[PDB]
Amino acid sequence: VDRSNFKTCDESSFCKRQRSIRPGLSPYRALLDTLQLGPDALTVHLIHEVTKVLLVLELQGLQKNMTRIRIDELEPRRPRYRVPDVLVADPPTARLSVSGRDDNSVELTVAEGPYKIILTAQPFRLDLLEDRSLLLSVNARGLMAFEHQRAPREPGAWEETFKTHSDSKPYGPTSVGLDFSLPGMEHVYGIPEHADSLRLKVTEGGEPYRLYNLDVFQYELNNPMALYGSVPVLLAHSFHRDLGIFWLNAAETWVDISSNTPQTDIRWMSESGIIDVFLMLGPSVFDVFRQYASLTGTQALPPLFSLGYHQSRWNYRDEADVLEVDQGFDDHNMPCDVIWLDIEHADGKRYFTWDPTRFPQPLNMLEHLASKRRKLVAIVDPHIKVDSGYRVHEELRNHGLYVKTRDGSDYEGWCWPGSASYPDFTNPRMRAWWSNMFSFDNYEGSAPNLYVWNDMNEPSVFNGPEVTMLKDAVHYGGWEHRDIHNIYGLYVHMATADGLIQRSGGIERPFVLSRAFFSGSQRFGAVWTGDNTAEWDHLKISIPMCLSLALVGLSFCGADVGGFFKNPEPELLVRWYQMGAYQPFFRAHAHLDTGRREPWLLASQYQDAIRDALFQRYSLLPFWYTLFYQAHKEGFPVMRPLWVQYPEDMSTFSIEDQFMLGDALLIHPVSDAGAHGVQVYLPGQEEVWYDIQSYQKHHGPQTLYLPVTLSSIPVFQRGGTIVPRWMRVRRSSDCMKDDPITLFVALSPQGTAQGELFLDDGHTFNYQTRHEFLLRRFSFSGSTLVSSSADPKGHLETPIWIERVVIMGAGKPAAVVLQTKGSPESRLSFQHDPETSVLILRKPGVSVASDWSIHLR
Amino acid sequence: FYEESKPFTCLDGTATIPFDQVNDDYCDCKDGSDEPGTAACPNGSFHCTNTGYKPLYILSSRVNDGVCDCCDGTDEYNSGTVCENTCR
Numbered sequence: 001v002d003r004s005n006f007k008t009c010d011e012s013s014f015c016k017r018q019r020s021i022r023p024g025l026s027p028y029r030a031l032l033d034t035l036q037l038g039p040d041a042l043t044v045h046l047i048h049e050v051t052k053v054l055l056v057l058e059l060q061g062l063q064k065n066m067t068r069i070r071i072d073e074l075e076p077r078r079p080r081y082r083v084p085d086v087l088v089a090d091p092p093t094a095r096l097s098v099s100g101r102d103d104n105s106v107e108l109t110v111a112e113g114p115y116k117i118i119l120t121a122q123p124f125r126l127d128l129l130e131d132r133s134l135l136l137s138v139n140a141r142g143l144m145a146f147e148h149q150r151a152p153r154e155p156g157a158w159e160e161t162f163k164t165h166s167d168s169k170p171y172g173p174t175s176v177g178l179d180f181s182l183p184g185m186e187h188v189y190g191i192p193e194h195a196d197s198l199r200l201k202v203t204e205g206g207e208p209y210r211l212y213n214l215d216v217f218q219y220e221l222n223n224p225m226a227l228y229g230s231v232p233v234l235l236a237h238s239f240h241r242d243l244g245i246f247w248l249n250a251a252e253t254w255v256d257i258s259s260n261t262p263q264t265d266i267r268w269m270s271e272s273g274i275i276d277v278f279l280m281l282g283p284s285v286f287d288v289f290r291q292y293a294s295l296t297g298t299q300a301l302p303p304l305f306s307l308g309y310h311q312s313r314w315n316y317r318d319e320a321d322v323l324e325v326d327q328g329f330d331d332h333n334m335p336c337d338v339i340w341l342d343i344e345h346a347d348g349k350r351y352f353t354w355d356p357t358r359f360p361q362p363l364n365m366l367e368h369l370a371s372k373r374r375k376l377v378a379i380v381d382p383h384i385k386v387d388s389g390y391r392v393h394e395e396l397r398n399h400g401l402y403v404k405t406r407d408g409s410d411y412e413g414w415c416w417p418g419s420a421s422y423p424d425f426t427n428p429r430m431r432a433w434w435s436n437m438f439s440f441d442n443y444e445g446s447a448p449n450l451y452v453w454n455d456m457n458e459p460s461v462f463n464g465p466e467v468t469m470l471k472d473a474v475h476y477g478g479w480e481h482r483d484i485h486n487i488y489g490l491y492v493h494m495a496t497a498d499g500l501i502q503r504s505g506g507i508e509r510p511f512v513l514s515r516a517f518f519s520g521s522q523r524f525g526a527v528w529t530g531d532n533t534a535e536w537d538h539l540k541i542s543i544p545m546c547l548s549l550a551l552v553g554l555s556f557c558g559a560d561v562g563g564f565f566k567n568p569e570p571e572l573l574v575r576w577y578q579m580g581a582y583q584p585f586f587r588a589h590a591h592l593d594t595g596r597r598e599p600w601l602l603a604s605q606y607q608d609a610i611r612d613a614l615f616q617r618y619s620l621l622p623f624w625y626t627l628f629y630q631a632h633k634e635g636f637p638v639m640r641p642l643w644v645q646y647p648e649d650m651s652t653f654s655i656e657d658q659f660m661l662g663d664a665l666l667i668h669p670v671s672d673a674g675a676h677g678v679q680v681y682l683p684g685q686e687e688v689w690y691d692i693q694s695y696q697k698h699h700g701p702q703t704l705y706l707p708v709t710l711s712s713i714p715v716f717q718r719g720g721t722i723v724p725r726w727m728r729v730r731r732s733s734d735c736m737k738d739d740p741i742t743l744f745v746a747l748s749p750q751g752t753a754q755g756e757l758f759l760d761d762g763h764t765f766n767y768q769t770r771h772e773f774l775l776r777r778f779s780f781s782g783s784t785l786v787s788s789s790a791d792p793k794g795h796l797e798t799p800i801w802i803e804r805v806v807i808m809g810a811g812k813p814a815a816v817v818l819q820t821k822g823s824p825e826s827r828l829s830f831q832h833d834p835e836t837s838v839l840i841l842r843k844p845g846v847s848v849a850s851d852w853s854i855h856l857r
Numbered sequence: 858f859y860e861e862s863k864p865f866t867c868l869d870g871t872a873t874i875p876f877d878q879v880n881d882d883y884c885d886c887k888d889g890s891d892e893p894g895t896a897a898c899p900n901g902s903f904h905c906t907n908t909g910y911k912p913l914y915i916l917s918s919r920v921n922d923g924v925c926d927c928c929d930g931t932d933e934y935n936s937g938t939v940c941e942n943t944c945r
């Protein structure tokens with residue numbers, strides 16, 4: 001990384017102004033005589049004692065244990081930005097009642113208790129409690145700072161330069177900031193995207209964490225520099241409680257973290273807009289996940305193929321290369337769902353076009369991939385070549401839909417096609433235009449098996465400050481780029497996803513991968529960690545990075561398998577395939593200057609290890625699909641830190657070399673060259689874990705030193721769970737999506753287990769528009785395995801049947817009896833290993849749509 | 858009085874099963890020899906008879922996968938995909 005190309009806090013004048021304020025007595029005071037209380041909100045004027053600037057505080061109790069604090073100017077020169085399209089609904093309120101009052105304090109009860117809010121007038125403070133437990137304080141260190149809008153036109157407050165880029169800053173200083181205290185909290189997480197540790201570090205002696213969507217070439221590890229996406233959500237965990245803070249601001253934001261009986265203080269500093277903050281009071285982490293999902297929505301249900309393996313590089317040469325890659329997977333018995341086309345596929349980086357030598361017949365190439373039951377992904381970026389012969393440019397220029405400069409002209413920056421303009425994705429008409437461009441009549445050469453990749457959507461501008469758009473560029477409604485920056489990428493993602501839904505007449509689920517993101521991006525598809533490097537520490541950082549995304553609702557995360565930059569040695573490539581195989585978004589991608597790394601190009605030992613990782617992922621597709629359905633329905637993360645499943649185990653709070661998939665699998669991928677074993681922490685008092693390869697049972701809590709070879713992927717199934725698998729691994733997920741299921745029943749020490757399974761057609765909205773799906777609950781206790789409906793609304797005509805049951809931790813029965821409505825009682829044959837206590841039930845033969853029971857006699 | 862037919866023995870000798878466990882869509886032999894006509898075994902093979910032309914063997918995982926693997930199209934017999942004969 002070239003750090004001189006990106007601003008430190010000292011080089012961002014508003015960060016320097018905000019951060020220079022040190023802890024002390026706040027000059028802000030609430031004017032209690034102005035207090036007004038209604039059923040939805042409490043409002044009260046706040047005044048700065050020196051400048052006499054009046055602000056309005058709008059304080060609200062909300063349903064589901066949240067509180068909303070909104071601060072804005074009482075009489076501004078012009079309106080301040082308020083983030084649109086991120087919140088999915090107007091949050092339902094909870095009534096605040098005055099239960100205490102004096103000349104400097106008002107105590108407010110939320111609904112019928114137990115939550116309370118104490119508003120102190122002088123100095124202005126808010127305290128949030130549950131009964132007598134102080135949860136959080138606001139402005140406790142007096143760091144609230146609201147720069148009021150001055151008459152439009154010390155150092156850098158108005159016109160400001162960074163390198164050679166001048167920001168005319170017509171509205172001058174307008175930054176907003178506020179501090180929060182978390183008594184009892186020592187561990188905080190989230191605020192992606194940073195190539196840094198899952199447990200966030202104190203920022204006191206260095207830089208704050210930065211949230212500003214940027215294209216950072218050769219980004220480095222364990223530092224707080226802003227990367228491509230920004231989710232202004234912070235989670236706090238302790239043995240006692242979970243809490244979250246959601247700072248709804250789309251402008252450049254800096255976050256300071258300081259630790260102090262234990263307490264963590266958080267400070268948010270934003271360039272513009274209002275103070276709009278949600279306090280999510282839990283008490284469990286699952287309550288915080290539900291709270292946050294009620295505000296910004298849940299993860300879009302991925303079409304099944306998109307949870308398969310993706311093969312990419314910059315670039316496949318032409319149609320012949322695409323078809324050789326396709327044939328290579330089948331000739332080497334390696335499954336793959338999708339082949340990707342990076343920017344060299346288009347006519348000189350004019351998006352929605354095809355290079356007429358490389359891709360003369362795109363429909364024919366798509367028909368060939370469709371005959372193999374595979375898909376293709378084409379890159380579409382939000383920069384349009386300035387070219388009068390390019391139809392997209394002409395229409396966008398003609399209809400004024402580009403982002404403008406202050407003089408009214410279309411902003412022209414430099415990107416992949418040379419001179420390019422930037423569509424204004426904040427304009428709803430531009431998003432409508434973009435979505436209609438995905439129609440099969442407009443995007444010539446596209447077909448229902450072509451999906452999309454949105455890249456460079458920060459936006460990346462090669463000749464712009466920090467490789468992005470000028471701060472004073474103008475958007476829809478007259479808002480400056482500084483006001484909207486962090487939602488620009490989310491808007492590109494949203495409009496592309498809508499384009500894929502629309503072209504099908506609202507039937508097909510989209511698949512869109514986006515580089516830039518914000519709060520709410522989980523509703524539009526997948527994200528990835530950008531331009532990583534073919535190095536062991538970048539393989540290791542993929543866990544904390546995707547975990548930091550999972551905690552803040554972005555469940556469909558991954559990193560480039562093999563690393564984007566440079567050539568991975570074959571052992572690193574194998575280990576990356578094994579890591580990637582157990583991460584939500586699974587794609588191999590590589591930079592323009594790298595050697596080819598399709599997995600069959602390596603020596604047979606490496607190919608074999610990679611094929612094994614691929615087979616493992618494909619067999620687990622029903623499990624992955626069910627976790628994603630639960631993320632879609634509940635807002636629960638797919639990939640989880642161990643502390644989410646073990647909230648009282650203080651030794652799990654910073655673990656980032658291990659993770660869980662739901663409540664059932666614990667994964668410790670090998671992440672060091674020459675490793676002959678791994679130290680696996682298996683938590684849970686009175687918990688058992690089964691090594692999924694050997695079936696060896698291990699009791700928690702313990703650190704096990706496990707031996708590994710090149711082909712090893714340390715995976716453990718938790719006792720108490722049932723994991724569904726497709727054991728007939730075929731070439732793509734479309735080939736497997738009507739196949740029979742094998743249930744893996746891992747018995748707890750109490751001899752019990754449960755697990756769900758979600759199934760539908762694999763790709764439409766029929767599950768929601770027609771309730772065409774199945775949600776089954778498998779449960780084991782005593783000596784009986786039962787299948788019942790977890791959602792009776794869902795029905796599906798399907799040939800899927802239960803071909804096998806593998807029970808771990810069971811003794812040898814005398815007889816196995818299956819019962820199901822409409823069939824005579826059945827006797828199953830079985831095989832049992834007394835050394836591992838593994839029982840295999842042969843061919844139950846029953847429909848996955850039916851209720852049934854298997855009794856071990 | 859009535860003599861019974863002998864059971865099927867896996868080519869690798871790992872099991873003896875009745876002939877109703879042959880091509881019954883469940884893998885009973887470690888070598889995949891009980892399921893030459895289905896996708897049930899991970900190591901089985903399906904024979905493309907390709908009447909009139911050169912015969913080919915394919916992976917069992919390519920039986921009824923919805924993809925045309927044999928030039929005679931016999932691998933796709935209950936998948937929804939109707940394969941045309943392309944052996945000429």
Ligand SMILES: *[C@@H]1O[C@H](CO)[C@@H](O[C@@H]2O[C@H](CO)[C@@H](O)[C@H](O)[C@H]2NC(C)=O)[C@H](O)[C@H]1NC(C)=O
Binds near residue numbers: 282283288
């Ligand atoms: C809202 O907050 C209440 C109070 O913390 C939650 O209720 C408590 O839940 C815990 C389990 O996490 C129990 O130990 C307590 O007995 C419950 N207290 C009361 C007063 O019921 C409640 O679950 C939260 N609700 C939501 C929707 O998040």
Ligand SMILES: OC[C@H]1NC[C@H](O)[C@@H](O)[C@@H]1O
Binds near residue numbers: 314455564
């Ligand atoms: O499109 C070229 C290049 N742009 C940047 C992306 O992060 C990378 O994945 C891609 O290959």
Ligand SMILES: [Ca+2]
Binds near residue numbers: 879880884891892
């Ligand atoms: Ca059989």
Ligand SMILES: [Ca+2]
Binds near residue numbers: 925
């Ligand atoms: Ca086939």
